[PDB]
Design a protein around this ligand. Structure first.
Ligand SMILES: Cc1cc2nc3c(=O)[nH]c(=O)nc-3n(C[C@H](O)[C@H](O)[C@H](O)COP(=O)(O)OP(=O)(O)OC[C@H]3O[C@@H](n4cnc5c(N)ncnc54)[C@H](O)[C@@H]3O)c2cc1C
Ligand SMILES: NC(=O)c1ccc[n+]([C@@H]2O[C@H](COP(=O)([O-])OP(=O)(O)OC[C@H]3O[C@@H](n4cnc5c(N)ncnc54)[C@H](O)[C@@H]3O)[C@@H](O)[C@H]2O)c1
Ligand SMILES: OCc1ccc2occc2c1
Ligand SMILES: [Mg+2]
Lengths: 1216, 107, 54
């Protein structure tokens, strides 16, 4: 058996001094980066004055010659939405290949209204892009109903002439502006004009982010064919005068990442070499474009091998981009310059600012990293650029600098920095086709600055160019962008020629972070400290983690019954790595049922002492535990990886979630808990194996901080990390009497649940087990004669709906992650992907291709994507399902597993194509994605089908269309919704997590109602109120007054006000996402009244929270509800057979203790969802206005919307 | 329709235009249930008319209109209430119901 | 434009014919001006050949 972590993440090569200096700067504080850049970028006063004069001259020429879309909007008096809608229509008309056919449709059909009748795919799929073109503003989703109205309006007002003009405009823009040509041959023909003036070209075939091997092969053959065409046209002009090509490494392999570095070097590198050999033969440039920050250092390993490969010798055309917005830029340049010296290759170095700024901010925040890998003030990037140009200009003998910029100030600074001695081949400028020519026509040529400029020339069809056009538009279209500012009349030339070097030099703190961008640790501000992650692209982090992970595998991990009195004896067995049973992770001593009962008694005896610890001090224990878990994260990762089959990325997320639970419940406690919120008493926390630290810690932390002693029963599969979590909590100050760890199987959980002193149960696990616990507790009442509270957070049958407006590559990435991360062993995992029929085949093909790029194996290797299933029993259960589906004729796609998996319990990621959603029965907790297809008109029926499973945990929707978002999100019934992103990894306090129906009782873990369930009198959560009053409640209150039930009418009005139904909040989180939290009705509440007044109070509580009711007909209280207003009657049904009239979403019970017990037993016997039952006596209803707590009569819904999905972050366009 | 509002001129022509800003992303849920019911009984033309009405309805429009500072001037489209339907044929009734339900009304 | 330029004279007539104060007569003329300009703009935004008059 291979030693644990012995091959975790070895670097491609030993890191040289120069490479290490790069890694050391990855997230260097911005204040430390700037001073040396300011120094390197400093020029003499004479040069600065000359540069300012040159920049002003360039800017005056630009502004003096400065419209197509603007002229169209002006001529036809179009609103912005009309302009956008027109361009979308033109785009669709241009999908008609034959011109005569298109013109006939325009003249005879489109112009006479009824455009909808003639044009499966919304016309407005790309309206966010056209919105940027027309308005300069990015909107992540498309108001397709506004656009449809606008299109009808403009066509009915202006007819064929406006359509004609729109078509001609879109044809010009998409064929000649956004691209140099549709094909390389067309692009080459169109390049002659500017080449004759002294420009050169670098062609971009627009390949990027291959999702499948077939995609990567297609992009390869496109590059290879383009090289031939470019090389034939170059005709010996060489690498400086003649044209070249630009490639993206992400186009050439579907797994281009540090985690897959071995595949990158083995599979991607030879492809680049083959393209480079062809570029060498034609003697053209071949440039490697720069992409995301986590790919920079990996790309250097390819550049190193290529430059040292003798087969490429004699050719100086290899080019490489460096992004000046990146903190590593100068150190990367030092590495490249040294590589050029060592190899003797005059590397062509394109200095750019960088194209992924918004995305880098979002990523660093999501990952909880120390700092950003890019600057956060635009002026810092400008100084970095000029400083790096100074470094490049000192090395023109060994590299060929290429200064890509549209900023006339940047250009002028470098033009003067480079000086009067110039020859072609010394350096050049670069610009983007259809953007930079106005500036560079003031540069190229002996009559201007006599400096050459290479035009980066996109080449491709309409489909190809639109894919990432948003990112390219933001490069020069954000409020901070030069090209936006040049066109802004309110921006003066003096403002445009301001010297960023001198401006930064004079700032009070040189290099301070942008005030409006939160470091990842500060996402929540004063509320709490965000947990920190680890950067698995950082070689220093990987090297240190390797050692910590190896060290963690040498630890003698144990889990023992940790009673208040000390460790107890019991049956002891080893804990084996599910990915390799030869790897013994530790030993667990399991709890006898006698000691479990003893632990509850000890918890009961210890309850007053722990309740007497002030809430603030309990919260301080949680915060100390979070600090300890953060510091111990690397060791915790190793244990989670080996015990629970988790990858390193997933173990990091697991530990972060535990830290976040601790800090969140600590903060919620400090916001709420006072002397009157008495603890329930001993709480039994039963947790699942699959989030063996996070959910374990969350339930226990919540119960403890609410003042309850805890009996912690971790899943039998994963006791070791649970024991370590308990050890950490105890070290943080939780007394042994307040937190007892009871390892063992369901028998230990059941013994704890049944123990007489158990005052509450927090269960996360399967719905079937929760149902057994519910039945156990139905026998039980507290000493006060009330039901024992149960939080039961259970399974899902989670769907994602994808329409024809979604971007297939984005869908596939989110599907692969949601379905197969952790081998599908997340309760949130995607189980049913629903594809609109018109796009289903294309997406399915891409999905299957992506599936086959996953690496399944023992998870102590960074290259492993999917680990094992937890046990052979889980494996057998999953495989039985797969074979049942296969036996029914369903198409089944499965990854082939390596022989090494035989020593563990693995199930290959599997895609099963279903005919109907009813083909599924229960949750299959494994790496099994089911795929169904739907016709667009049947979307609403499909949402019904998703709801019809009875589950309601996570749900995803991929669409750009606001009408579809509004429809689907208003009709779906699930607790956690996700728009244009994956449906997994819910964040504490950002996506409060938990579902409804078969998926949960609530309240949500990681949300503000959670702690209130763990005390006898619930506090008012932060932000928990609503100004809205349910109108049926109001009608009922008036009816009660008309009946003479004056006190009840007043109680009803009070319930109407006290209800938080309609709460609608945005929760703080990362940029590029909107995270919403809303309170809705639960659904139909079962009312079991005993008296007329009790019924009126129950109805008031239920109606005030938006619910309908089924009233127990056996109460005999029918005559108490005579002559209801129709609005109330619509919400009221009477039920003689409760099981026939469900599912219910909760219950209110009135009666004495034995009536409550009997009703609780009858409710527990109802099929389907566990019901959150609240009971009260008639006297309690009379005495306590909060006898029924309204917190538990609403349903929390979390919605997380990826607002960067259109390709950029609109809000961050204003942050410079 | 209201004087000084965007629906007014459309009453004075034989075919009403689409007024500026007149749309809504919301679809009446009862309209949606009606369209599925029409689907189920094979009334394909009527189900399509129902879906089209659900989309073109501006029920739920909720705009702030430009005006003076220190004031928020809001303009919203709600259901009319209960619409009297006087059909002659089954298809006509289905079309009338589609129009009325898509705009949030009872009938 | 004509009502705006002639507002002072129109005010005098409205004041004496309809019992309005000067401020309310100003509001009256302004509202007429606004209807004219609003319906003009709404027309420019909407009306085309297929929107035939009654
Ligand atoms: C020919 C050419 C090729 C290019 N190739 C690549 C490539 O392979 N990879 C790549 O990543 N980029 C590349 N770029 C650059 C990118 O696409 C943008 O065009 C470029 O960053 C814009 O810089 P600027 O001098 O034109 O505009 P400027 O407006 O002077 O600068 C805009 C840039 O400033 C930066 N910026 C904006 N806001 C902030 C902020 N708050 N904090 C810090 N920085 C900020 C961003 O980099 C932004 O793009 C290329 C550009 C050109 C012209
Ligand atoms: N809704 C959520 O937030 C959420 C989160 C994670 C997992 N889950 C669900 O958890 C399940 C997977 O976890 P699991 O396999 O560990 O679940 P499980 O139901 O098998 O076991 C969960 C826990 O209950 C205990 N248990 C088993 N039988 C018991 C009994 N008769 N009485 C008392 N306790 C008993 C187990 O020992 C374990 O600690 C999945 O169904 C998943 O969807 C839900
Ligand atoms: O828009 C210019 C451009 C060129 C190459 C690029 O590579 C990655 C982003 C990017 C942008
Ligand atoms: Mg189990």
């Amino acid at each position: 058996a291979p030693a644990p972590f012995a091959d975790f993440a070895p670097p491609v090569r030993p890191q040289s001094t120069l490479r290490r200096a790069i890694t050391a700067a990855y997230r260097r504080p911005e204040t430390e980066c700037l001073p040396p850049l300011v120094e390197a970028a400093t020029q003499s006063k004479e040069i600065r004055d000359a540069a300012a004069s040159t920049a002003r001259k360039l800017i005056e020429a630009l502004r003096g010659k400065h419209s197509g879309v603007e002229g169209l909007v002006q001529e036809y008096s179009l609103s912005s939405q009309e302009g956008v809608a027109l361009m979308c229509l033109a785009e669709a008309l241009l999908r008609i290949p034959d011109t005569a056919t298109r013109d006939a449709l325009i003249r005879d059909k489109i112009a006479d209204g009824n455009w909808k009748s003639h044009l499966s795919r919304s016309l407005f799929v790309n309206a966010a892009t056209w919105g940027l073109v027309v308005t300069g503003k990015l909107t992540s989703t498309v108001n397709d109903r506004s656009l449809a109205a606008a299109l009808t309006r403009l066509i009915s007002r202006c007819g064929e002439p406006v359509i004609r003009r729109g078509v001609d405009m879109a044809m010009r823009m998409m064929g000649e502006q956004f691209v140099t040509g549709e094909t390389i041959r067309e692009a080459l023909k169109r390049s002659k004009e500017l080449e004759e003036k002294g420009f050169s070209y670098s062609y971009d075939m627009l390949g990027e982010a291959a999702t499948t091997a077939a995609d990567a092969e297609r992009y390869y053959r496109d590059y290879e064919s383009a090289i031939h065409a470019i090389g034939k046209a170059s005709a010996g002009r060489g690498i400086y005068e003649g044209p070249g090509i630009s490639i993206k490494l992400s186009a050439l392999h579907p797994r281009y990442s540090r985690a897959q570095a071995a595949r990158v070097m083995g599979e991607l590198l030879p492809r680049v070499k083959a393209l480079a050999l062809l570029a060498k033969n034609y003697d053209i440039g071949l440039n490697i474009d720069a992409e995301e920050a986590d790919r920079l250092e990996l790309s250097l390993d390819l550049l190193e091998v290529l430059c040292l490969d003798g087969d490429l010798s004699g050719w100086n055309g290899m080019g490489f981009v460096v992004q000046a917005y990146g903190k590593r830029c100068p150190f990367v340049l030092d590495f490249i310059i040294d590589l050029a010296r060592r190899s003797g290759r005059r590397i062509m170095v394109r200095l750019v600012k960088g194209a992924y700024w918004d995305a880098e901010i979002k990523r660093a925040q999501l990952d909880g990293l120390a700092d950003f890998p890019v600057f956060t003030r635009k002026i810092h990037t400008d100084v970095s650029y000029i400083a790096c140009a100074a470094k490049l200009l000192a090395a023109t003998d060994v590299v060929f600098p290429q200064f890509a910029t549209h900023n006339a100030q940047t250009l002028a600074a470098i033009y003067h920095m480079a000086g009067k001695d110039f020859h072609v081949g010394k350096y050049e400028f670069q610009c983007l086709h259809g953007m930079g020519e106005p500036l560079y026509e003031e540069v190229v040529g002996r009559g201007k600055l006599d400096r050459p400029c290479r035009i980066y020339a996109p080449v491709g069809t309409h489909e190809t160019l639109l894919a990432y056009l948003v990112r390219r538009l933001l490069e020069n279209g954000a409020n901070s962008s030069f090209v936006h500012r040049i066109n802004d009349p309110k921006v003066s030339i003096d403002e445009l020629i301001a010297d960023p070097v001198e401006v930064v030099r004079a700032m009070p703190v040189v290099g301070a972070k942008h005030d409006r961008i939160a470091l990842p640790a500060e996402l929540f501000g004063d509320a709490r400290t965000n947990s920190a992650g680890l950067d698995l692209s950082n070689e220093e982090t990987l090297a240190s983690l390797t050692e910590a992970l190896r060290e963690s595998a040498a630890m003698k991990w144990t889990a023992l019954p940790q009673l208040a009195t000390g460790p107890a004896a019991g049956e002891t067995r080893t804990v084996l790595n599910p990915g390799d049973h030869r790897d013994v992770v530790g030993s667990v001593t399991e709890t006898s049922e006698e000691d479990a009962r003893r632990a509850v008694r000890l918890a009961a005896d210890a309850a007053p002492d722990w309740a007497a610890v002030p809430p603030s001090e309990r919260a301080a224990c949680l915060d100390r535990a979070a600090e300890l878990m953060q510091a111990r994260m690397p060791t915790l990762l190793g244990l989670i990886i080996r015990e629970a089959g988790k990858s390193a990325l997933n173990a990091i997320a697991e530990v972060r979630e535990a830290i976040d639970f601790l800090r969140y419940y600590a903060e919620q406690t400090r916001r709420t808990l006072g002397p009157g919120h008495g603890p329930l008493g001993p709480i039994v926390c039963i947790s699942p194996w699959n989030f063996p630290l996070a959910i374990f810690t969350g339930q226990i932390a919540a119960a403890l901080v609410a003042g309850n002693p805890v009996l912690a029963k971790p899943a039998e599969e994963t006791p070791l990390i649970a024991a370590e979590g308990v050890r950490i909590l105890r070290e943080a100050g939780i007394p042994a009497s307040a937190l007892q760890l009871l390892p063992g199987d369901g028998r230990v959980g059941a013994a704890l649940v049944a123990a007489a002193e158990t005052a509450g149960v927090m269960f996360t696990g399967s719905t079937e087990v929760a149902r057994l616990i519910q039945a156990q507790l139905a026998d039980r009442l507290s000493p006060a004669g009330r039901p024992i509270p149960l939080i039961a957070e259970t399974g899902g049958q989670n769907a994602m709906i994808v329409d024809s407006s979604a971007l297939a590559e984005q869908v596939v990435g989110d599907v692969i992650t949601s379905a197969f991360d952790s081998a599908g062993q997340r309760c949130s995992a995607l189980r049913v992907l629903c594809l609109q029929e018109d796009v289903a085949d294309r997406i399915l093909t891409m999905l299957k291709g992506a599936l086959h790029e996953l690496h399944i194996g023992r998870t102590d290797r960074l290259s492993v994507d999917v680990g094992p299933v937890i046990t052979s029993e889980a494996k057998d259960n999953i495989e039985k399902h797969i074979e049942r589906m296969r036996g029914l004729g369903r198409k089944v796609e499965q990854i082939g597993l390596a022989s090494e998996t035989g020593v563990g319990t693995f199930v290959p990621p599997t895609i099963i194509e279903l005919e109907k959603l009813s083909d599924l029965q229960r949750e299959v907790f494994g790496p099994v994605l089911h795929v169904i297809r739907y016709r667009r008109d049947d979307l609403d029926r499909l949402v019904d089908d998703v709801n019809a499973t009875g589950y309601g945990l996570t749900f995803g929707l991929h669409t750009r269309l606001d009408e579809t978002i509004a429809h689907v999100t208003s009709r779906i019934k699930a607790g956690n919704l996700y728009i244009n992103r994956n449906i997994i990894g819910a964040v504490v306090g950002v996506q409060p997590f938990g579902g409804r129906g078969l998926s949960g009782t609530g309240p949500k873990a990681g949300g503000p109602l959670y702690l209130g369930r763990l005390v006898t009198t619930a506090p008012v959560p932060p932000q928990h109120s609503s100004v809205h009053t349910d109108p049926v409640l109001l009608d009922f209150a008036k009816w009660l007054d008309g009946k003479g039930a004056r006190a009840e009418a007043e109680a009803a009005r009070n319930a109407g006000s006290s209800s938080a139904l309609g709460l609608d909040l945005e929760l703080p989180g990362p940029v590029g996402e909107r995270n919403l939290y809303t309170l809705h009705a639960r659904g139909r509440i079962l009312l079991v009244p005993a008296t007329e007044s009790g019924l009126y109070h129950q109805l008031a509580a239920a109606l005030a929270t938006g619910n309908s009711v089924a009233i127990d007909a056996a109460s005999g209280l029918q005559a108490s509800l005579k002559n209801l207003p129709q609005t109330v009657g619509l919400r009221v049904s009477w039920s003689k057979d409760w099981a026939a009239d469900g599912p219910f979403a909760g219950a209110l019970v009135e009666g004495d203790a034995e009536r409550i017990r009997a009703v609780n037993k009858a409710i527990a016997a109802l099929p389907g969802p566990l019901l959150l039952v609240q009971a009260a006596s008639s006297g309690e209803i009379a005495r306590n206005p909060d006898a029924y707590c309204l917190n538990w009569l609403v349903e929390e819904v979390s919605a997380s919307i990826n607002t960067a999905a259109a390709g950029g972050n609109a809000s961050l366009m204003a942050i410079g």
